[PDB]
Design a protein around this ligand. Sequence first.
Ligand SMILES: Cc1cc2nc3c(=O)[nH]c(=O)nc-3n(C[C@H](O)[C@H](O)[C@H](O)COP(=O)(O)OP(=O)(O)OC[C@H]3O[C@@H](n4cnc5c(N)ncnc54)[C@H](O)[C@@H]3O)c2cc1C
Length: 563
Amino acid sequence: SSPVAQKYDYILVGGGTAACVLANRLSADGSKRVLVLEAGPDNTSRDVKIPAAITRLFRSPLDWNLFSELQEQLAERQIYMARGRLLGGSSATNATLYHRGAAGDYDAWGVEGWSSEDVLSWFVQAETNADFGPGAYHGSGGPMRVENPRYTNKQLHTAFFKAAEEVGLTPNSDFNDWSHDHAGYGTFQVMQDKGTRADMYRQYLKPVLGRRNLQVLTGAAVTKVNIDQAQALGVEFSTDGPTGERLSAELAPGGEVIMCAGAVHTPFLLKHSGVGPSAELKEFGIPVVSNLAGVGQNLQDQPACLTAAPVKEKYDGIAISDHIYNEKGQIRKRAIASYLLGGRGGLTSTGCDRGAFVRTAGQALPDLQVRFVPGMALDPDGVSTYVRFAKFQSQGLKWPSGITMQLIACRPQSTGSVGLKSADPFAPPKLSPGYLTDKDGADLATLRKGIHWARDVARSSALSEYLDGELFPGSGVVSDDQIDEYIRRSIHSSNAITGTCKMGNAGDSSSVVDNQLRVHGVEGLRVVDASVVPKIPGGQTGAPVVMIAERAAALLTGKATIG
Ligand SMILES: Cc1cc2nc3c(=O)[nH]c(=O)nc-3n(C[C@H](O)[C@H](O)[C@H](O)COP(=O)(O)OP(=O)(O)OC[C@H]3O[C@@H](n4cnc5c(N)ncnc54)[C@H](O)[C@@H]3O)c2cc1C
């Protein structure tokens, strides 16, 4: 009742990060009728816009609330895996850190037309940096906002860097400068506009909601993609939910369909629609249009564990928790004043924006990413701690002062999978991250060795002046075997998730999409979101999604070509 006798040149399933990019570029003339279907509501929540309020988006209505299958290798725990549910997708619910990985992350992709040189310019193109001048590696005219964090903990941040210097690390002035090595300590830039989240709804879609050739439907939950037998012909969706009507959106001649549902829901929705492993499709009685075995495999996510240590009594009150909450748990009016009048202060911080990339065992590229947080976790699951920090408000307790080093396997060797658990196209998918399953035990070894690394840093002279013991894992956990068991019961997602519909060369039978993102054996079908990522880069995966999205967009409209 919303696409009524209307045929669209590009239907977009999903209204997230990449989808917000293409809608902008493809609606940019007037000849194309763009449609954008999004399960979740408009982007209007104040919790989206204030960075420190990220503590309220986890496990919230704006999250899909995905939980994984039992992971036997993880002491049989389900893993909560954050996924944004609103226009702007996970860009509106992320920690905003800006990371391209290294040039070798893209060279190693293998694919033709996506080397480090081919992608570099698409990055710069979409960037406007507040803190680096325009050059080979940074843009100034782009739609993304990028800035050095406008919050600084004058004691804990400076003691962290002195400490990482003590244990032998070198600084790194720009983790997205490919001319020098990617390892080292320093400061993560964040996709924020003067302390407001600079999500992709705000930077790309909100400035273009005027275009009459641009139709954006929130509340609109896609169920499948029409593929008359191969050619896609549209989508089916429901505006109310699993108890609503079964509408249909038709495409115009040549009208393509663009999978933007993200690394979790795209491979899922493709399967329900007929493209995937037949063995899995036959189990629920779904006709096979294409039998590509790569749909729903190769799921890569970066696992994390943490250490936590309180500060000495004498330095009580100097953590970021002390800057946001008072001793009674109420939000400080001073912090609100610095944020609303100046775009400064504790509320501009997602917390984890200082850190490092470290080689643990002479690897080609760093295997460990440390994230330092001048706040003290109260649960070894760092995601659950943020949820807890939210509910702590107004209870009347003082959150203890301290620090946290979150440790992350930024280039993991484990892979996962995304599958079908029901025929109900509104059911939670079969999600298995598969952390710690690589055949050499390397991911676990990277995380164990980060624990030793984190303890060295915390033992340094720079940090031992401020610290008083160790809460997590703590004094009991001494031997490697004990560290591993702690890692297993505390491993949490650092929220990347890539690869479930990977691109590859012609004759890559394991590949799903080709180097122009159209999928093997379907007409008018393309995938442009994090799923196409063939190897996860070394860093948080937001920025490369945009780069993919800006790239496909141009290619679609004949402004550049690949190969
Ligand atoms: C909590 C969190 C923290 C993160 N931190 C960082 C970080 O600091 N820096 C960074 O660079 N990256 C970070 N990431 C990752 C980054 O946000 C993602 O990699 C990126 O946003 C993925 O973009 P996408 O377009 O592939 O998917 P999304 O942005 O998720 O877009 C997919 C969209 O599809 C929609 N959808 C799903 N099913 C349907 C359906 N049936 N019908 C219609 N729409 C549907 C979803 O609602 C969603 O809006 C973080 C991720 C999370 C969750």
